[PDB]
RNA sequence: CAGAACACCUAAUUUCGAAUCCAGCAUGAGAAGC
RNA sequence: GUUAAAACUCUUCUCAUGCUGGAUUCGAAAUUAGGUGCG
């Protein structure tokens, strides 16, 4: 029941359409660039048809590049990802559209299209199951980039795990072990494969660099690698969108590795903001390390420093990312100092994918290898077959898995009231991996956040509502961020309570009364601790607490 | 007869558009979120009544021209059966030749229907006295219908087109006084044979 | 020809509805009435059994069903009610199938 | 599917009715070793394998019935989807493990509870799911979960409803809705004094009632449905006809309309109101007479009633 | 029977702000601007016009000493007997003057910019609060085609008086800060309501 | 067999005294109404989970409802919604009437329809409290009398 | 294994999301074969 | 072992026609692009 729309090389369009009868759920609607094909992309999106939802795994263009184009032909109803993926998609779509206007290629979608994609853009974080058109959808972290998820869709005809891109051990800002469904996985759609050296050549260039990174993941991991090792010389970020992504991962640090959920980059990262500071740092002859994101030396800011760095016989150029075909970066890496680092790789190797399949609870019925290069997909598929699991490659491309519901109780004692065969029963809806109703005799056969009491939460929210610090708008926004999930509400409450060091203002509503600063700050800390203790509670309990003060949501 | 007239009518919405929900269960399920729901399908599209708008338009213009056209808008009024609109849309004796469809949209509710907020500004004090949220259909939304005339005459396409220009002038449904429902129409008719499907 | 039996019952697919009569001048709701109607997307099932079948019976029945698609089934056909879509699964049958 | 073995797609029986039985060791046709091992038969490609196993390749699913295992067994080298295994312990393990393309779901059969549970736990620790066996489709229309004793649980008490095609599970909101609907239907069945003792009325002659009823029958105020419901409300007593004519003649204060049908003619507003009160007074004088007299009044205008 | 067409054309003289009412377009736009402007899906600018016209005529006719109802009071029932109920509507009768939204002649990117407004402490003289709102530039042209179904002689004069009151006070929001000071051009014509018949 | 329902509102169809009556035949052979069922149902709804008003005279109520219907405080829409909230239980009708009567501290408005007629503000507040007390006393009566009061005003 | 372009500091918050009318009529109740 | 037995009140004909969820309510009410620096 799943169609791989261009799921071989991901160029000129790629998509995973899981049609389940009542829903045309769509996964990984993105574009890969090779660097006239746009018409074939257009024909493929018109070939997709009406999709009820455009699930998004991660914020790269491979999975998120055709979302406003599906909005343009109006084929998608709802677009859901993580909030980190949503704002990184904002930066991606704006930069991609600016690149389409700069290169004079006919624009695929429009800026208004990007906006109207964000009209219908819902968001949830990990481990938040949503019941959409009898499909239960859950997100899990797969350690690729920030906000990157693997999708777990339970339909009545089976459980599908769209893995997306899987992270490696060398990813420092995230947990290494990718989160998995705790239940049965029937079909697993897996995408195949495709540090001290950097520091020591930074010594042999500085005391005697230029680093081309990628703005999502790669530049922030180079920055964090330089943050852990404090050497002697300084680091500069000469990249606008890389600086915005760095600031957002500082904002979205609750979505990161658990150790890094407590600043993060411990200062000392002078970021160049405008192009005049860029020309200054290009003409600066001081020994310093310049990390910046253009990609493969083809367009961006890097090119302000390239000339200065290129002719310099003391400088070096540190390729921490893959260089694709027909790019200036590839033309300088092959030869037509030069160092290439292979540890800075967001994509997992083959053995990490074997680890990913092996720590499933059950062995999947069929592993659908989709993207990656051909020969690596071939050898990976052979190693899946050596683990006795079925493989369907997209070039080569069937039981039926029905999740039945059984009554398991007596139905003889039934009556009629309104031409209905109704009977009252008290039982237990046990849920195996075959929802089962079972009577009470079966049950007898079987049988970071602070913490506050419920009455203290009630009295503190009532006090701060009378003091006007907590508001109906505040409770409504907190309920929206809490229905998003716990971590999004943690980020919202931390963002409200955080005191701006330049101005001394918190985003809390000011108290109404004759309170002196100290009392105002103690009331703000009371609101912070009270709503974190509310965050620790259950969702229905939070709804029953917040419906007293704000009658709607 | 041996020929039938098919008028494919395409509507592009130019102003905001509202047509209120008529199903009591769906309206009562929507009053916990919006005070004015849009008349919507169970397949999540938007339908607009279209026969009454065309009949009202044609009756107003033909009464203005001076023709002997009845007013079936008065309370429990009966059509006489001799008017041109009685021949087209219907009478109590015989059914009408024109079979007007609902205006089903080409897009689903999550793509064309938005939830908006209207107020009641007090004349002095300039404050929000009342505030109500209502659903509406955006501008640029495309609706489709097929008007099916069983026994075509020479003046059936012309009167339908004149009624469509009157609906463009005055609005199709809902809050026509506040500026809602100002739309535009494309017409592609074709006289099809009645025995077409037999083959 | 069998009656068109719906698969769902009245609480799923039948909703009562408000219909109006509006004065042509003064644009005000003059008459109001409630009418039940069947929702969109509801499915109905019929079984047409043709004894002594000729060659053209499937073609004529399918053409009649296309005519019902174009015109409509039920009442209020001029107002847009009853526009449906048919799907036909024909099956040639020996009459002696029950005689096992 | 397999019912505890009958495996439809047919209804082939492996070791009931309308079947192609395949006996094991250790209907319309009986297939056994004629076809020996390593040879395939059609019916759904069926191949038998020696035990010291029936292999049906269908359109959807490749089913394997093992039989009793004693010694190295013999297993197919193709693709297995279901593995029906007896359990009455390490021999079954490697019989599973040494087979390529390990099956989707295995089935345990022909044993007690403890041995089947121990083997089942050993197969979940091998990461292969098990099923332990011991019709209208059922629909949960419910919506909170729990995790007591490693089961996902929900405390729910509700109703089961049984239609001709499905069985649904509903909560108290459905029962409240149908109870309110049936209470509204029950209370709309009675009025307090229907068909009871005969109950402050204007009086008018029979000829004037004939003249007024004929005049309001020519123009469309007193019509055939009006006379029909008037006679039906007169049959259930005098006060019921009083209530019916007061409901019909009632002018709404918000709209200024009554439930009479408007006259067909060129009458102005005052004359239309005079005709409405003429109809009210004429029918009020008509409720005075006896039932046979009113029937002789109204048969000349509505022959049904 | 005749009908009256009043083609009005607004030129904006002081910057215009009408807030966006659509909840989706609001929450999509409340991460970039704190005060979105009312916008079509076809990227034009929307202004309500019937309420401002009715408010202008209600305030002025109440000041003149006429027996007009105040429909601005909360849950106020219009009388159905006054001039404003005849023109704009009552609970029994609909209004004769069908008044359209003020569709701008230009797209958002040509007439709509994003301004930043402040809130400054009176003692400190420092910018305490900052926010951003969308506003319509000056010289932007809006249009409407006010249609009167059953016209009398005085309705065009009342519409022009209401338009002069809108030029006095303002349309849209933020009127006390100086927003919405506009100018109107009126072209009036009586049209037969049988004129599309051919 | 013992009926657990008081036999009021008891209509007169010929020589057959009558009541339309919906309920349950419990064979414990008792015949209780829906209220016993809800007190039963919530019983299991707290048990199985564990295992894992003012007074007004009936003349005063109909007089007050007639007076508020004439000044359109108690509309047909309001009587209908109060009837649907009263059919869901006493607590739901209590919460709905408390929601309707609640003076919002910001706007200063109540959810009642304003009175039709020239009234002073104090008298308008008295009429709002009269509507609150009258419908609050209507929650106290059983369902069959609260429909026989409200059938005259919203048929 | 992918987008990329004189200086700051700020770009937050709140309140409303309700009320009312209407839910009626009219016509047809028969033929014919076996 | 019943003035028994044998024989189907069967066929033909769409609850259809006439009626627009319409009318009444402005997303506006609060807040200076301020500070910083020598033509
Ligand atoms: Zn990626
Ligand atoms: Zn006529
Ligand atoms: Zn008035």
Short mmCIF file of C-alpha atoms in Angstrom, two decimals, chain A residues 50 74 76-77 120, chain B residues 107-108 110-111 114:
data_model
loop_
_atom_site.label_atom_id
_atom_site.label_comp_id
_atom_site.label_asym_id
_atom_site.label_seq_id
_atom_site.Cartn_x
_atom_site.Cartn_y
_atom_site.Cartn_z
CA UNK A 50 -4.17 14.50 -3.50
CA UNK A 74 -2.77 22.32 -3.59
CA UNK A 76 -1.47 18.59 0.58
CA UNK A 77 -3.84 19.34 3.46
CA UNK A 120 -1.21 24.66 7.14
CA UNK B 107 -10.55 21.96 -3.07
CA UNK B 108 -10.90 20.50 0.42
CA UNK B 110 -8.40 22.83 4.95
CA UNK B 111 -7.19 24.65 1.81
CA UNK B 114 -10.41 29.96 7.05
#
